[PDB]
Amino acid sequence: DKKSARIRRATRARRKLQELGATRLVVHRTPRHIYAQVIAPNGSEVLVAASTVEKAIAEQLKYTGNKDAAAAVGKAVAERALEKGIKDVSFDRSGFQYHGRVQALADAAREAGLQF
Amino acid sequence: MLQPKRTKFRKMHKGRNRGLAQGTDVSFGSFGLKAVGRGRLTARQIEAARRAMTRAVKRQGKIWIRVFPDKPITEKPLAVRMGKGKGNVEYWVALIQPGKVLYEMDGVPEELAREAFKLAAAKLPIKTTFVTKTVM
Amino acid sequence: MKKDIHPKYEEITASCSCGNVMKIRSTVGHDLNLDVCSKCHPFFTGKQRDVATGGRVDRFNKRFNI
Amino acid sequence: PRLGDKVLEVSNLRKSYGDRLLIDSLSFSIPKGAIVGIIGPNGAGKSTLFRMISGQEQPDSGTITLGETVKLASVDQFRDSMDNSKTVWEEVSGGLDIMKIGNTEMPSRAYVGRFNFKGVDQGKRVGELSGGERGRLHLAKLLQVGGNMLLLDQPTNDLDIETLRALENALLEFPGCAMVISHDRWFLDRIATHILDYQDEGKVEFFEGNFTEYEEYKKRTLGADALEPKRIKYKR
Amino acid sequence: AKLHDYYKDEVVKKLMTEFNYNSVMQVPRVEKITLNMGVGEAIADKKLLDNAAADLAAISGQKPLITKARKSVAGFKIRQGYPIGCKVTLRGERMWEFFERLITIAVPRIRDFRGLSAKSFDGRGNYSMGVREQIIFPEIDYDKVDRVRGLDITITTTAKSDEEGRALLAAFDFPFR
Amino acid sequence: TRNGRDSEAKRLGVKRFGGESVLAGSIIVRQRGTKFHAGANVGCGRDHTLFAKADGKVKFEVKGPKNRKFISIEAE
Amino acid sequence: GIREKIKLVSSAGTGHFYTTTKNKRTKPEKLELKKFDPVVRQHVIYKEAK
RNA sequence: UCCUCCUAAAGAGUAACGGAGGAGCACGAAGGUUGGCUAAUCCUGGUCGGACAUCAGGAGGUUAGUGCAAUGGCAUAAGCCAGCUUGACUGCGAGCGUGACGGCGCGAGCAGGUGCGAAAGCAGGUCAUAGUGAUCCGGUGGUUCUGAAUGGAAGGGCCAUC
RNA sequence: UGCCUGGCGGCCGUAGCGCGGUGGUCCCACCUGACCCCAUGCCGAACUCAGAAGUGAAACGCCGUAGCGCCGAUGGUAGUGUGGGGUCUCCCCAUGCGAGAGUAGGGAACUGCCAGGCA
RNA sequence: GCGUCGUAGUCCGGAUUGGAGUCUGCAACUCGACUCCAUGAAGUCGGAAUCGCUAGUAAUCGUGGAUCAGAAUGCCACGG
RNA sequence: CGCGGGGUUGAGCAGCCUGGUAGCUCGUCGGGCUCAUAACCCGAAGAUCGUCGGUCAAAUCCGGCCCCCGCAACCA
C-alpha cells in the first residue's frame, strides 16, 4: 500500500530526530495540495502551520498543488516561524523523495530566514 | 518395546521424581489402572504387563497405553573403575508418580476387566489400583 | 523509456493476401506481406474443417454397390 | 561433427594491399582428415589467408567455397582479446559449472583441468600468469566450439617440448581437418600431410605429402645454391 | 491505441449492461501483459539467453529483463544466481499495440490453429497462454535463429471473479472454445 | 572421552539497577544481543553495551509497539 | 593464513607508513588509498610496498 | 590455549577422565554513508517443464536470511540491490566494567584534516561474543635525544614495524 | 461547542482479524497526460511532474454484528523462606509469600495538540 | 544422342507403414502376387577371418522354361 | 570394547592425497581359426565404490552402525 510503505520509508529519520530532541518541520504532499507544520521536540504540541489549503495562500495561486504553490507555503511558514522565535529547525523528509515540490518548499523557507 | 525414534540427545541427567501426577483421570476407556505408589517403570515391564492384559480379554476391547518410557538409563560395564566418562545407554524407563493412569480399557465387563488388571499389576513394581470413568 | 536501449519502433503498414491493410507499429523496418488476418478468420470455418473422424458403415454401403 | 568430402576449395585467389600483393592465382581443394602446414617468410599473407577463410576479409578475385558440413574453430597469433582481470575458471567457463562442448556436456572444472589446470591453479588471474599457461588457456578457451575445422596460427609459440609432443599426439587422432601455420619445421615434419609454401612475387605453392618427400620433389626439380646470408652489422 | 479506443467506446457500454454494474470504474479492465521465455537449459552457454533476449526484443517493443534462479535445486542441477528466463512487462500504449498485433496478425498464424481454451484461467480473470513456437511473428524470418523458442503470455485484469474476465476477453472476440 | 572443554565466563548482566544515581559514561548493562534498548540520554557501543550519556537516576520502561525494554536516565 | 602483511608507504616524501594485509592471489593489483599523514597533517595517497 | 550451550540452585562467579559442538581465519569490499526493497512454504493457471527451474495472482506473516559452531539479537532492519568514497584517520579522553597481577574491554566529548548527505547527522572497521604468544635477543625505516679530550662517526635511546 | 476529514503524537490486540451496510459540499484515493528536472538492472507498476473529465469500484475511514484473536477474576492446587517432626531416594506440622493451566465473565478502543468542511 | 541434378543421407537408397484398388481362386484374417498416392528406416565400401575365377572365363545386362488356378531374389538354359 | 586397519564388478587389486574424470589382469558372453577341445585373434557387456546417514557439488570430508583382520592385556 502507498501510505503504509511510506511511513516505514521515513521512520528512522522520524525516530533519530526525536532522540536528538530537535524541532522538526514535517511535510505532507498530497496530489492536490501540500502541507507543512512545526512541532515541539516532544511531538504533542504544534506551534505554527501553513498550507496551500489555507485561504490566505490559496487566494494568490491559480492552481494549488504544484511547485509555485510549494514556494508560497514554504515562505508562508518561514515568515510565521521567525515572528515567533523559532529559527532552529530540522527538515523532515517524511518519506517523499527530496526532489520535487517537497524541495522547493525547503529552499523557499530556507531562503526566507529559516536556519537549517 | 516402546523405545523412541530419533532422540535429540543420547544421555540425560538422573533428575528427581517429585510431585503428583497429571494424567489422573480416565479419558478414553471406561476402566483404568491408576498407580498409587512412586518409582520408575521400564520398557520391558510395560511390554510384559501388556501381553497379560491381551491374553485375559483375548479377542476384544481396546487397550490404551498412556505412559511412554522416553528416558535413557545408562550403566557402567562390569568390573570397571569410576570415572572415565559416562556409561552407555541400556534401557528406557518412564517416571511414575502417584495418581498417574498407566493402562486403560474399554469394551469389556467390569468384573472381567478387574481380572485383567489384577494380572497386569503382578508384573509392575508399584502399588497400583483400579479406577473407572467419571463425569466430572 | 531508457534513451536508445531498445530496438527501433517504426510504424509499418503490413498487408495480407486479401487486403486487410492496416497501420500497426512494430520492430521490423519493413512492411511485410503475409497470409490471412483476422478478417479472413477460420473461426467460422476452421472448426468443422478440423473434423475428419466418423463413417464406416456408410463406407460399406458404398462398397455394397452389389 | 561428421565431415563430408567437400571441405574447402579456393579457386583463383588474389589479394593485395595497395601496390604490394600477397596472394595471386592460388587454388586448391582440401580432403578429409588432413593436416596442412603453411610455411613462408615473415609477412607473406599466412594470417590474411585465415582471415579470408573465416569471414574477415575480401579477396581481389574471390571464390573461397567452404563445405556445407563444416564448423570452424580459429586460434590466432596474439592473446590480446581476453582480459587480464579474471580467473581461469571465470574466463574459460564463463562462470558456468556445465560446459556443452559441441554436442555433449562436461563439467567446467574437468574440462579446464584436462589442459593441466588443477583446482588450486583455477584461481589464478590471467594477468598473473606465465607465457606457456597463457597459450594453453588460449587454446582451451577457443577450442570449445567443437568444430571440425581447426585454423591454428602458430599455436607452438611458447610451449615446452613436452606440451609440444602432447599437441603432436592430440592432432593425429582428431578426425577433422587442421591448417597449422608454424615456423617450426621440426614440429610440422611430424604431422604435416599437405604443404602450403609461400615464395617470392606472391607465389603460393601447394604440394601433397610431408616435408620428407617434399624435399625429394625439390631434388627431382632440383636447383642447387648456397649463398644464403649477408650478415652485415648494426653500427660503425 | 486503436484497441484502447475500441475498449473505451464499445466495451464499457457492453460490460456495464452485461453485469449491471453500479459504477463506471466497477467494469473490469486490463492492466498489464507479461511475456515470459524461460530459457531453462541455458546453463551450458549464454548464447541461448542472448538470442532469447533478441527474440523478446523482436516480438515486444521493449528490451527483456533477465530473471535468475531463486532457490538452488539439485533436481535440475541449478543453483541460486543462475540466469534462467527473460521477461517483458507491457503497460499502456505498448500493451495495446502488442495486443493488436497479437489478435490480428499473430494468433491466426498458429499451425493447426483451433483457438484458445477459455477454461485456462487462474480464478482471478488473468489469462495464460503458451505459443510453443517463435515463428508466429513477422519480426523474425525463420532461418535466422537455430532453436524454436516457445514462450508464454499472461493478461492481467482487475476482475474479482473469472466469468467477468471471460466476458471482457470475449468482448474483443478471442478465439475461445 | 571426547568432550570436556568450556570457555571462561564473560560476566554479563545489568550493572546499575533501577534507581541508581550514576555518573556520566558509566556502563549500565552488558549484553550479547540487544535485550534492552537504548532510550533517552543513553547510548549503545559496538558490543551493544548501554552506557550513561549523562549523570542521573536510571529508569526501566517497556515502551514501544513491540513491548521492548528501554533504558533511560533522568536528569536528577 | 594466506594473507601476507603489506605496508602502505606515504607518497608525501616523508617516511611514514600504515600496515595491513592483502591476498596476493585474488588481488594482484597495487592498493592505493587517501589516508592521513601525521607528519604533514594532510590527506595524501598511500601506495603499497613490501 | 581460545569461543558457545547445559550442569550453575531466576545478580556475578562456581568442579569432575561430566553432557554436546567449534577456532588458529575471511573481506580493498563482505567497511562508511545516501537512496531504495522485504522473506520460507503452499494452492490455481501457464511452451518443450516434471513433485520441485522462469512467469501471473492468492494464501501465508519471518516457519526466511547473516562469510564460517552455539546463544542472544535483527522490520527504524544487523537481511537484499545500487551510486559516491576510504573514518579499516592522527593526538587525546570525563567516566565505568573485568582481572591476584601482566593485562582485556566500553566510552560521550575536545583539537587537526576527510568521506557521504540539501541539511539534521553518521563514520576511530565488519550484528556481538573465538580467529591467539610476555620478556630477552636481533632486523628495517624515521629522529641531533645522547655521542667517553673537542668536531664527526660507531653504538645506544625514542616512534612505526618484522 | 456539535459534525465530519487531514497531519503529528500518547498507549500498544479490551486497541488486532473476519462478516454487513455505508460517503463524496470540502478533504482523501484511484483517476487524465507525460515531451519536460526526475525514474524503470523491461515497463509512468513504483518514484516524480503537469492537471482535472469520472468515480467512491478498489483502497481508506465510519458504524452494526460475539466466528476468531485478546483480557480475565474469587476459591482451590503446585512451589517456597524460617522453625520443628516422621516409617526420611519422599513427605507432614506452625507461620509468611503464593503461582501456572482452567472456569464465571469482560470484550468491536480511549485519548491531546493543530489546520480544513458543514451547521 | 539431348538435357538436368554440382556431393548432399542428396533428384542416392526403396526398408517399414496409412489409405485406394486389380487379379486367380468356394474362399487372400493368421497367409498370395501386383498396381496407384503419400510416408523415405539402416546405409558414406565394411574388424578378426574368409570365397570364386586362366578367356569369350571373371564382372555386368536382359530374355525363357519345369513345378503351377494364383504364388521366385531359387533352380535349370540362352544370348549382349 | 582398550587401540589401530580395511569393505571398489564374478576373483584379486589400483584410484580415497585432500572435491567435479571408474581403471588393470583374470573371469563371462558373441563371433573366428581347428575334424573337435584347449591355446591364440576380434567385439561387447557389468560396479547405488559396505550400511544409516550428515557440501551446488564426495568413493574421498564427518559421524552412527555392521562385518572381518591385527595388536595389548604389565608391577604386585
Ligand SMILES: Nc1ncnc2c1ncn2[C@@H]1O[C@H](COP(=O)(O)OP(=O)(O)OP(=O)(O)O)[C@@H](O)[C@H]1O
Ligand atoms: N589492413 C592492412 N593494411 C595494410 N597492410 C596490411 C593490412 N593487413 C595486412 N597488411 C600487410 O600484409 C602483411 C600481413 O602480415 P601476414 O598476415 O602476411 O603475416 P606473415 O608475415 O605472413 O606471418 P607472421 O604472422 O608469422 O608474421 C604485412 O606485410 C602487412 O603490412
Ligand SMILES: [Mg+2]
Ligand atoms: Mg547465574
Ligand SMILES: [Mg+2]
Ligand atoms: Mg567458590
Ligand SMILES: [Mg+2]
Ligand atoms: Mg556484513
Ligand SMILES: [Mg+2]
Ligand atoms: Mg539504509
Ligand SMILES: [Mg+2]
Ligand atoms: Mg552493512
Ligand SMILES: [Mg+2]
Ligand atoms: Mg559475525
Ligand SMILES: [Mg+2]
Ligand atoms: Mg667525541
Ligand SMILES: [Mg+2]
Ligand atoms: Mg640509531
Ligand SMILES: [Mg+2]
Ligand atoms: Mg530413388
Ligand SMILES: [Mg+2]
Ligand atoms: Mg511411391
Ligand SMILES: [Mg+2]
Ligand atoms: Mg547414418
Ligand SMILES: [Mg+2]
Ligand atoms: Mg555421398
Ligand SMILES: [Mg+2]
Ligand atoms: Mg584350368
Ligand SMILES: [Mg+2]
Ligand atoms: Mg539375372
Ligand SMILES: [Mg+2]
Ligand atoms: Mg512356362
